[PDB]
């Protein structure tokens, strides 16, 4: 999304799935008042979805192109005994998530 929205660290159209099974449409932005955590909004699709993810506990693995997913973007996230899966619209948007995830969970320099 070239028109960077304003406020959320990060945020944009998303897709979500479990072990690669059934993919949903929802919305995945960062809340800047805790740059620690990835919340996400999904209409009336499913509940069981995580609402806060504890990025600092979260473990980000990019699966295999091999696999038989839906989108070819996409990494995997295991964490607090669950799996859960983010595709992006492309690389580059692909980028700015697993960065911005990253970053996150590993707290580097005085910022957030």
Same mark, same amino acid.
């Given at each position: 999304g070239s028109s960077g929205s304003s406020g959320s660290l990060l945020c944009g159209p998303l897709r979500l799935s479990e072990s690669g099974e059934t993919w949903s449409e929802v919305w995945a932005a960062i809340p800047m008042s805790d740059p620690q955590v990835l919340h996400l909004q999904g209409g009336s699709? =499913? /509940? !069981? &979805? %995580? !609402?806060?993810? %504890?990025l600092p506990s979260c473990k980000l693995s990019v699966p295999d %192109?091999?696999? !038989? &997913? =839906?989108? /070819?973007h996409v990494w995997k996230l295991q964490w607090a005994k669950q799996s859960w899966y983010l595709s992006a619209s492309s690389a580059e948007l692909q980028q700015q998530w697993l960065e911005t995830l990253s970053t996150a969970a590993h707290s580097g320099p005085s910022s957030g």
């Open positions: 699709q =499913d /509940g !069981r &979805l %995580p !609402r806060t993810i %504890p %192109p091999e696999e !038989r &997913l =839906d989108s /070819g």
